Subunit: 203 residues, 4 copies
């Protein structure tokens, strides 16, 4: 009795099998939408930290603002960290509950965090740039490749790109991904694209 | 050039200190109360950081958390969330010229923009979504872009005195407690405050500048 | 057994309560004194906050600053250093066994005393004239195997220099010491029971809970 | 028109009076070095965030504490400092020094520094440390290849130990120097993994 849970870059989850399989068990869709969004050159992390790239430099800087710090504010800023948990049945994946910030409706608990920020014209009310960044964490060799959106012997090639991924077995929930240290740093970092817009991924 | 006020029902109100204080066309937006507790007994400030008060121990002792914290924390799962939003009002008078939450920017057509922050946190236990306790603080903020007015709390009356002979010119009374209050004359929004011969002159100031009221049964407290 | 008194001139003193008050050891770290502050007027709490007083509006205003908060910052540059060192002691009698800090550890050939100290100075070029300061110190207690006041700098031994923290030892447990609309007043009673504004050698200062 | 190099031995230096390249003065201030580790390896930032890599894995994971979040907690000791050294743009020679202990007398080089020890509770013995710091300054053909511990220009000046920041003065300004696939390129070149003396450390931008 074990699983693989795959949080993907479209705000979706999936249960596959490590039982000769890889076969899709259950496959969840919530009302929250994308996992990374940006009208926006500034590249958001899932974190969601904020970074500046201009191709004149190598300079990929972190900037002194995060999608968080910007909410506690010429241009008036709005947004909202969410925190809603589900509420699932390890296999079948049918929500027992979904209990949000402003609501609650009655053994595998899938919590969505989603931070946004918009910037609108003060007179105008209409936004000029925005950011929505979210992610999934849960509680009660499975190698992922991230540029080749795959769990890997069976293999399940996803599209869209993979965000979090947990194998659940026995004791459950453990995720997947001098010179040698100089070598071990660049695999910590990954840039993806969805669909659409650039993003970072973290370690 | 007038005096906006917010309160603990959540609503907002603007007056008219030149026309003897009389409210002029005043509505608002739903989000519930400005404090909703549901938990010897902890007390929420509207800032979001809260205090236990052991009524035996008379122990208004600052419990090492906030409403913000718990959301970035076993027995119960801490759901919740903060929300900021802007109700740009052509008021005087009305006049929802737009609204902007994380869920869109529905506009309007036809100069006072109005912030609304809300900090809830339900705690529910994981076997089923049963709700074990929750706090939801909040507060509007004020910004405008193109007598002597006081709002001491206790009674819920905003009052205009004068600089001349310090007499009361007019006074307006309120139903729920004043949360905040701002005068809007000339343009620059002015916030009315709702608060060894010095060692008590300056002690006076310190017990002056905490208000421990209660609204809709809820025990909450303010300060500066 | 004994009672420990962190007092506001950086000192410690141990009395035992089952003997009228007889002292015993009494620690005088080198670190000086607790609140110091080149000060209508800006008042720090101990621990670290800063509070603006205006005698016009007669309110005690909050400032958007902390002594730490200012180190992570015009014409004036900011200086300081949050320090925090622990002193091992013997519980009785005396006596510093080991000591300290960010800058080394000495053990000399059961009751562990931690000092914290936040500074901020404000200097500005060309020549660096310090225009003001704020230093707030601190103390916490621990250990390995009676009604203090606050207004009178007094215990049940009458102290000289105001008190800041104190504590009990018993069956090995540093236990600290404290310094209808009818129910509201009783809570409304405890909110002005929390904050204390004092005076120590010039600087006016705050304490609360 | 100067060039300034703060290096991992707690010393700064000023080289190149626009034509020469000759270092016109070089002050050192304690503590000593810009990075300590003592010392499953856990490697600090100059910041210092804390990271753990295991060669059993291929990944560099970051840890949930920084040299500061743990200062507010093994008994842990430590302290962030901020000391400023005032000297005149050229020749050096310190005019003021304002640390946490008062000002002394008679272009401003601002050093920040976090340290943390871990000692035994009952016995004041130790058990790891972390001291990390770095330099800032303002007032009143430049290039570094940090892995080759030198500035270049014509000419080049190799330092020991590796150099960390590099501010150039010219006029009245202090300027520093350090498809998706090409963006993929700007991140493996954003971080640098170093060594001193002795111990490993991390860097950003770079």
């Amino acid at each position: 009795r074990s699983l693989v849970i795959i949080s993907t870059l479209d705000g979706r989850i999936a249960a596959l099998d490590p039982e000769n399989h890889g076969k899709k068990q259950w496959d969840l869709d919530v009302g929250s939408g994308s996992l990374v969004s940006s009208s926006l050159m500034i590249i958001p992390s899932l974190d969601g930290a904020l970074f500046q790239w201009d191709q004149d430099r190598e300079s990929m800087e972190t900037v002194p603002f995060t999608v968080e710090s910007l909410l506690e504010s010429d241009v008036v800023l709005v947004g909202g960290k969410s925190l809603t948990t589900y509420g699932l049945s390890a296999y079948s994946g049918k929500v027992r509950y979904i209990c949000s910030a402003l609501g609650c409706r009655q053994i595998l608990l899938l919590q969505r965090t989603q931070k946004t920020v918009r910037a609108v014209g003060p007179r105008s009310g209409n936004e000029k740039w925005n950011f929505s960044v979210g992610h999934f964490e849960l509680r009660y060799v499975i190698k992922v490749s991230v540029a080749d959106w795959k769990v890997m012997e069976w293999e399940y090639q996803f599209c869209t790109p993979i965000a979090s991924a947990w194998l659940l077995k026995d004791g459950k929930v453990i995720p997947i991904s001098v010179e040698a240290a100089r070598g071990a740093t660049e695999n910590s970092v990954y840039l993806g694209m969805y669909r659409g817009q650039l993003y970072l991924q973290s370690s």
